[PDB]
């Protein structure tokens, strides 16, 4: 539930927000995309698993963790996306094609959105372009993200949280620097006003020899969390791998339906054929001779047309879309 330096905020500019996307994945054949942010989805304050609500960073000087519900999160690239699942840092969602991806949290009028560029194109499988999986068609081998949230595409490492400096912990009065920790909290302070000097103060505390607040820093001794190795956070010195969590929504194998293009009409002339073809969408026709030279040809076709293809005594083979290979032998 840390904060990342999102490049594009709600308004126009970069900010530091809980909802920074720091990586995006779209290799799934069905168009589903896996997203990675700094929030913890499906978790309450203590981290207990509960789908209905999630936890995230809080815009306050104590910077505790505060929580919200599923219904107020939205995802969109060009039009609104549909959430397919969520766990911890990661989301899975189905999105319309677009050039960027945006995640927005809507706490009433507080609509905090983070946007990151990523070209997501409508992708298909098979040898025929199609908008939608056909109701009827061949069941061909495909690979798509598994909706099971307990799966694992891998593992990501996390480390002890690094520094989190503040100047609200500091205060200037009559050209003197004081540290004001939150009530009952031991806050680690360190400063250099000439000599370098460190310490921990749990209460309103003076420091001497200091006239500028820029020379001193204070921050909580917060080891009670684990943070992803993000580039947007200055790091703890002991950056050993202190935890490995799974990468849900493994890219699993399955079968997908793909369309069946028009059955060609063969029109034959001496040592050659004339295939009359219809294909509303881009369909791949490939051919190859069966002699010493394949002379293989490939072509993506739309509309209706006709192709004259010489066939020799050795023969010819062609595949029209997802149909089976067809072989011929001339005389």
């Amino acid at each position, epitope marked *: 539930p840390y904060l990342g330096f999102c490049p594009y905020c709600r308004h126009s500019a970069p900010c530091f927000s809980p909802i920074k996307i720091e990586n995006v994945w779209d290799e799934s054949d069905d168009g589903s995309i896996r997203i990675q942010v700094s929030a913890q989805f499906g978790y309450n304050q203590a981290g207990t698993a509960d789908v209905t609500k999630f936890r995230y960073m809080s815009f306050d000087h104590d910077h505790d963790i505060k929580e919200d519900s599923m219904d107020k999160i939205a995802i969109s690239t060009s039009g609104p996306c549909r959430r397919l699942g969520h766990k911890g840092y990661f989301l899975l969602a189905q999105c319309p094609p677009g050039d960027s991806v945006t995640v927005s949290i809507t706490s009433g009028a507080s609509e905090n959105s983070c946007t990151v560029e990523k070209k997501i194109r409508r992708k298909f499988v098979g040898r025929e372009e199609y908008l939608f999986p056909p109701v009827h068609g061949k069941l061909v081998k495909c690979h798509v993200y598994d909706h099971l949230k307990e799966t694992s595409a891998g593992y990501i490492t996390m480390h002890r949280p690094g520094p989190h400096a503040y100047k609200s912990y500091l205060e200037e009065a009559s050209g003197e620097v004081y540290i004001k920790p939150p009530s009952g909290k031991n806050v*680690t302070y360190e400063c250099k006003c*000439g*000599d370098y*000097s460190t310490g*921990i103060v749990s209460t309103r505390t003076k420091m001497n020899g200091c006239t500028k607040a820029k020379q001193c820093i204070a921050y909580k*001794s917060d080891q009670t969390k684990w943070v992803f190795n993000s580039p947007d956070l200055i790091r703890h010195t002991d950056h050993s791998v202190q935890g490995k969590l799974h990468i849900p929504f493994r890219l699993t194998p399955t079968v997908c339906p793909v369309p069946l293009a028009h059955t060609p009409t063969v029109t034959k002339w001496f040592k050659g054929i004339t295939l009359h073809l219809t294909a509303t969408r881009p369909t791949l026709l490939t051919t190859r001779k069966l002699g010493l030279r394949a002379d293989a040809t490939a072509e993506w076709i739309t509309g209706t047309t006709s192709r004259n293809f010489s066939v020799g005594r050795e023969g010819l083979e062609y595949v029209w879309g997802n149909h089976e290979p067809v072989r011929v032998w001339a005389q």
Partner: antibody
Amino acid sequence: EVQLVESGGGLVQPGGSLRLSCVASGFTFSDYRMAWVRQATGKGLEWVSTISQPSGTNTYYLDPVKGRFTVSRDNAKNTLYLQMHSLRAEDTAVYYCARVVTESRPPAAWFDVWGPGVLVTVSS
Amino acid sequence: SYELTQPPSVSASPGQTARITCGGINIGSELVHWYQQKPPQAPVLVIYANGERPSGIPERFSGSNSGNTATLTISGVEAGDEADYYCQLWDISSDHNYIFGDGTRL
């Protein structure tokens, strides 16, 4: 070569005073915090005092040695100093003058270079 | 004030791995440092910052710290590893005190 060499120790009566010297070489004496650390015979190492850098404005001491033992430094001759007053029997020990390497965030201090040490004995 | 406790002794024939533990309240939240001593020679730092070492320390030495326990792990013990070992930390809330452990012999 980075080397720290102690001197000045020996036998002293209880209630006496002494001045331990430690000359430094091979590094910028003014750039590093320094310390005196103690080891009694058959006991563990125990920290005595630290003097900061470059001017040594802030000096830190162990609780019983406050008000009696004083650290000082001089960057011109690169020499650390510990003056002792009102010496007592348990001060009998070997002292190492130690260069201090301090890392800002998280605040952490560990000693890198030590001298061979010098013995003081406090007995009647 | 933190109290550092180590076992008074650990016995290890050569060839295997030896673990020496430093115990203290909530020491996992701070950075421990392990020093090795052959009396009367001055000790030598072998671990600092819970996971990393000065130059020249062989690859067999490793350190860890978590919760209430820090651990010095020495794989493939040899005769030369027989030494005193002291865990260290810098309790800065206690007026910049440098607290050492009681010690452990190998």
